[PDB]
Structures are given as C-alpha cells and as structure tokens.
User: Which sequence fits this backbone?
C-alpha cells in the first residue's frame, strides 16, 4: 500500500476529487465520504513517528480507512443491494485511478479487502 | 457508540487502562493499541452527536475503530495465529466492562462485529 504521508495525502486529494466529481453518489454521500476520508488523513499524520514505519499501526490504519469507506457505502444504501453494487464499482474505480495517478500501479490487496469488507458488512445488516 | 465527546473520553480512558493492565497482550501491542484508540477517538470527537456524526458517518467510524483494533490484533500474531483467540477474547472482555462502566449495558453488536472483523481479517 502506501507509507509516505506525501503519498497518502495526495491519494486522498485525488480520491476527494474523484468522489466529489462522481454523480453516482448523492450529495449526502459526497460530503460524508468527504469528511470520513478527511478525518482519516488527519489521523494518518498523528502516528508514532508521523511519516514513519509503524507496520501494525499503518496496517490497522489502512483497514480503518477501508472499513470507513466500505461501511459508508453500505450504511447509506443498505435498503437497495443494487445501488450498493453499482456504488462499489464506482468507488473501486475511483480508487484504482488514484493508485495510478499517484503511484502507477494498483494494489488489489487494498481493493479486494474493500469488496470483502462491503460483502461482509452487507450481510451483517441481514 | 462514543459519538458525543464526553462518552468518548470515558470509554477511551477505560479502554487504555484495560489494555495496559491486561497480561495477555504483549508490551508492544499495548503501545500500538493505545495509539490507535487515541487516534480513533479523536476522530469521533471531531464530529460527535447525531448531527456531526450522522448514522452513516458514525457507523463508518465504528467499524473503522473496530477494524483498527481487529487488524492490530491480527498483525501482531507474533505468537502465531495458532493462539489469537486469547487476544480476541481479552479485547472482547476489555470492551464489555468499558461498555458497562461507561454506558450502562453491553453492545453485543459491536462485539460480534470485531469477532467477524478479526475472523475475516485472519483469512
């Protein structure tokens, strides 16, 4: 995944541009996805050595970022499993494009865990 | 869950005290868990209540806080996955008493979610 704050920050700014410019998500989702990832990037700065190694911490902080986006897609459209499916692809593609415009290679390890987080979080509502 | 700032600080102080006093957790994980729970709870205090932390924004942070503790346990399986239930039940206990001592009852949902989160993060 990411490590340097210069990479995680530019990843969020790309993501906040892809999300806010995505008509798939209603305005209630565009600003909630805004503050959710904005509260995360402010946290990926208050680390142990800030932009440092962390490992366990950086890993856990990545699953917090993934679960926050995974649940947000679920919690805002749990009534319709169809919208959940189309917004998962609209979110995942916005991720993959930002992995390319900041790193140059998509790491499916973080994207597959999101689709596994969305898949599990969907059934917990059932 | 720990939306409003007052509720979040009491749960934070309880959790940090329960993790530091636990013998199951090693020395390093007590530190990394403290950083994650202080980092996560400061995110809850930025919005809080039901207006700033709406249901969608709250439930996202809840599982974010649940996954941050779940993966931290999953990552530091330095004793091997062979024995991670001891750290799962210990985190489950520490959450149950902090639930009762700061909110009145226990939330069997947020507890079993961590069980699902730890279980799925294992594979």
Assistant:
């Amino acid at each position: 995944p990411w490590a340097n704050p210069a990479k995680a920050n530019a990843f969020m700014k790309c993501l906040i541009q892809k999300i806010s410019t995505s008509p798939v998500f209603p305005q209630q989702e565009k600003e909630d996805m805004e503050e959710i990832v904005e509260t995360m990037m402010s946290a990926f700065s208050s680390m142990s050595t800030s932009g440092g190694s962390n490992a366990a911490k950086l890993q856990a902080m990545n699953m917090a970022f993934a679960s926050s986006m995974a649940e947000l897609v679920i919690a805002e459209d749990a009534d319709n499993p169809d919208s959940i499916s189309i917004k998962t692809e609209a979110l995942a593609k916005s991720l993959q494009q930002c992995f390319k415009s900041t790193l140059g290679s998509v790491n499916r390890h973080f994207i597959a865990e999101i689709k596994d987080l969305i898949g599990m979080f969907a059934r917990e509502a059932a």
Notes: The CA atoms of residues 15 and 98 of chain A lie 6 Å apart. The two ends of chain A are 32 Å apart (CA to CA). The helical segments of chain A are 5-20, 27-41, 56-75, 81-100, 108-124. Chain A has one domain: 5-124.
